[PDB]
């Protein structure tokens, strides 16, 4: 078994994978491109999507949240227990024209010096008044600035159809004749101000099969010892994985040698008797629901 | 290919798949089986595992522990760690532990001792494995409060608020990397791709290349990617630089399926 031959086939599959993922038939031109280094807005965007926090390639764009001295803070005021992050939807629509195009939207915050557990919640601004809890995070202390990332795809999709819309990141509240715990009485929560202020990172579209097989324990295996279930849908994977560019169903991982294999499995709980006490055991990965070439 | 021949072979493979998952050489002797129907306590426990609600190779044993004796603003659930120590006998055997429970308008709940969930109008399940791990180390309980928002307007702060429970547990009973040139297992192997050197490609401006890697090795069944990572790239169309993200480009680990 020659790993050097596998590398050869892996490499040629890479060539096809990248072109097909970009829905190109052949690599594009250049020379209309000037020489030297990329613009820093491009590098910032590219760096943003490499920061750590469907088949076809997504265009990546970035829209930074409106600067904090505009009408932010004309009304509700930034703080250390609550931060406010507003976005010009016309700029969002500039980066992703129609909402159907959006595939993922991430809200990115650069967290500061932290030295105690802060539990924070993300809220969306609505009508013109109220808020909807979106999600929360439990942040371990750290003396290193780390980026936070929140998935806000559904919200941004709506914005892509108001004109100024915002988020709020606040502190959590314990609720229990009712008692409440407070954080906001000591002394900016996360980075606002500057060109590492919060931004929306946007990904958008631009402008071998599972085969049914039912196993009956008695009928197929002569097995009486399993009292439940009487049978189950094991199913299985079969069909070729060959190699315009389909590539998306035949070799989407660009293996040197794709195989039809289970993509998603799920368990099978059984009831049977060991000695004469009943057991209930969960067997992992017994049922094939989908297959893929990989 | 005859699909019927492969069906014949999957069927005979299920025979050994089930038995080796149970670490059994042959189906257990059933000449001592208590006759007739099976205990409804057992069936209720089977029912609870089979059905799901808002949410390793070898067979894990399944055990359930109900709750002992409040509002519609909070629900307090207690269990004695005695009764749970009888289910999972030693704490390191614990594979997973779920808490089970059973409206007109949205409401938003919280678990303290953790997680929280939003319930839609019309059971329920919470993963509490780590909390139930240490409880097996004497009486502990769970907090299901309601959620509240708080913020600051002037000097003004504001707050707003809008078959018994059961603990289901699974337990065990009482990834390769190659750098060698040796093929003995299925493993991820290193492979660096240089766009210019390997493909003759000058049009990708940022990543000069990347560690694509690949899977390879025998399995007692193919060696395939388990975890992949995306690759972002920068190139120009016309005078326009573009950032694109490509999924499933980098193999980080391999499995056999």
């Amino acid at each position: 078994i020659d790993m050097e031959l596998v590398k050869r086939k892996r490499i040629e599959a890479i060539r096809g994978q990248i072109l097909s993922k970009l829905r190109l038939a052949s690599p594009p031109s250049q020379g209309e491109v000037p020489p030297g280094p990329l613009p820093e807005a491009v590098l910032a965007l590219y760096n943003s999507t490499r920061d750590r926090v469907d088949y076809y390639a997504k265009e990546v764009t970035r829209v930074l949240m409106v600067e904090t001295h505009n009408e932010i803070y004309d009304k509700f005021k930034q703080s250390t227990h609550s931060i406010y992050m507003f976005f010009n939807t016309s700029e969002l629509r500039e980066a992703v024209p129609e909402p159907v195009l959006l595939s993922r939207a991430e809200l990115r915050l650069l967290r500061l010096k932290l030295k105690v557990e802060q539990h924070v919640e993300l809220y969306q601004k609505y009508s013109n008044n109220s808020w909807r809890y979106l999600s929360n995070r439990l942040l371990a202390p750290s003396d290193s600035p780390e980026w936070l990332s929140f998935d806000v795809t559904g919200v941004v999709r709506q914005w892509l159809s108001g004109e100024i819309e915002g988020f709020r990141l606040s502190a959590h509240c314990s609720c229990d004749t009712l008692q409440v715990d407070i954080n906001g009485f000591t002394t900016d929560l996360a980075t606002i101000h500057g060109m590492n202020r919060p931004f929306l990172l946007l990904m958008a579209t631009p402008l071998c099969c599972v085969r049914q097989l039912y196993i009956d324990f008695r009928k197929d295996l002569g097995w009486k010892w399993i009292h439940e279930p009487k049978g189950y849908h094991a199913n299985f994977c079969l069909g070729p994985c060959p190699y315009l560019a389909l590539y998306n169903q035949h070799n989407p991982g660009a293996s040197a040698a794709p195989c039809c294999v289970p993509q998603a499995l799920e368990p099978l709980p059984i009831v049977y008797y060991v000695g004469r006490k009943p057991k209930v055991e969960q067997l992992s990965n017994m049922i094939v629901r989908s297959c893929k070439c990989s | 290919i005859d699909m019927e021949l492969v069906k014949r072979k999957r069927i005979e493979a299920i025979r050994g798949q089930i038995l080796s998952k149970l670490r059994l050489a042959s189906p257990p002797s059933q000449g001592e089986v208590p006759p007739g129907p099976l205990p409804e306590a057992v069936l209720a426990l089977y029912n609870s595992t089979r059905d799901r609600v808002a949410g390793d190779y070898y067979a894990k044993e399944v055990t359930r522990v109900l709750m002992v004796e409040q509002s519609t603003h909070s629900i307090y659930m207690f269990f004695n760690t005695s009764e749970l120590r009888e289910a999972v006998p030693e704490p390191v055997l614990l594979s997973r532990a779920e808490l089970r429970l059973l409206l007109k308008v949205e409401q938003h709940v919280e678990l303290y001792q953790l997680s929280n969930r939003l319930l839609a109008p019309s059971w329920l399940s919470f993963d509490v494995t780590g909390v139930v791990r240490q409880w097996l180390s004497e009486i502990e309980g769970f907090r299901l409060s309601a959620h509240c928002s708080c913020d600051s307007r002037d000097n003004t702060l504001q707050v707003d608020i809008n078959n018994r429970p059961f603990l289901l547990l699974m337990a065990t009973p009482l990834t390769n990397y190659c750098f060698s040139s040796t093929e003995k297992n299925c493993c991820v192997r290193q492979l660096y791709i240089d766009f210019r050197k390997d493909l003759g490609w000058k049009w990708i401006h940022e990543p000069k290349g990347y560690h694509a890697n690949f899977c390879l090795g025998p399995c007692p069944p193919c060696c395939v990617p388990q975890a992949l990572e995306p690759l972002p790239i920068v190139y120009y169309v016309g005078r326009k630089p573009k950032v694109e993200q490509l999924s499933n480009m980098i193999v980080r680990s391999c499995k056999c399926s």
Partner: antibody
Framework: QVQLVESGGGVVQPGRSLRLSCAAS????????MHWVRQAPGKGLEWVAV????????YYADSVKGRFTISRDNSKNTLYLQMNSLRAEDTAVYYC??????????????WGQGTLVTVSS | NFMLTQPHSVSESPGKTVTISCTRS????????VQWYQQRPGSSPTTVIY?????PSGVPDRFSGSIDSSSNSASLTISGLKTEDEADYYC???????????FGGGTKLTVLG
């Protein structure tokens, strides 16, 4: 396509022995378990015997156990049945049958045309 | 092995529907899949139902298989009877204690003419 042609049926003095053949075309005969089934004039089908595709494993009905022997040879894609100490009871049309996944699951997917053996004097 | 008992014969008029029963003598009918073969005189048999209720391609939906656990039997049902359905029908199952294949005695179906 998928076909099973049998030969060697005939008339045999009672205590003697024939060997039926069943040549197979249209499929990888090597991979398949194979069966023999028989039918006495006017009476039902009667499963006779089976072999694994390798040789190896053989099972028989009680009615023929000590007497009949199955064999196959994959190099000729041909299944055989050495019958021993024939009787008028064994007078029947003999079919070779290929199972559908397994006889116990989906029965027999294909049959030969049959050869008649009549055991008389 | 166990026994599968079918009626010696059934008959019905053309267009009508008829059922052929296949009773198992011992052990639960649900222990094993039941198969149904059609055999025309002179022909070798062919499948009309397998795995209790599945039709091979080209077998019309007038042929259906079913199982009555309450009476430990399998039933072949043929609707819209046509002259061509006249044949002998065999059920077939498996035992697991004899590792053997068991056939019913067969039923002659007459389409009344």
């Amino acid at each position: 396509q998928v076909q099973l042609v049998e030969s060697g049926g005939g008339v045999v003095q009672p205590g003697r022995s024939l060997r039926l053949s069943c040549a197979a075309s249209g499929f990888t005969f090597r991979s398949y378990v194979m069966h023999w089934v028989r039918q006495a004039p006017g009476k039902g089908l009667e499963w006779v015997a089976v072999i694994s595709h390798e040789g190896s494993l053989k099972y028989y009905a009680d009615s023929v156990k000590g007497r009949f022997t199955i064999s196959r040879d994959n190099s000729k894609n041909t299944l055989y049945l050495q019958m021993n100490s024939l009787r008028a009871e064994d007078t029947a049309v003999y079919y070779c049958a290929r199972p559908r996944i397994a006889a116990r699951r989906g029965g027999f997917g294909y049959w030969g045309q049959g050869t008649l053996v009549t055991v008389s004097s | 092995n166990f026994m599968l008992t079918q009626p010696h014969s059934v008959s019905e008029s053309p267009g009508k529907t008829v059922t052929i029963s296949c009773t198992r003598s011992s052990g639960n009918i649900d222990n094993n899949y039941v198969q149904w073969y059609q055999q025309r005189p002179g022909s070798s048999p062919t499948t009309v139902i397998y795995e209790d209720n599945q039709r091979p391609s080209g077998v019309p939906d007038r042929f259906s298989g079913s199982i009555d656990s309450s009476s430990n039997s399998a039933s072949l049902t043929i609707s819209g009877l046509k002259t061509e359905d006249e044949a002998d029908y065999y059920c077939q199952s498996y035992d697991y204690d004899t590792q053997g294949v068991v056939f019913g005695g067969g039923t002659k179906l007459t389409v009344l003419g």
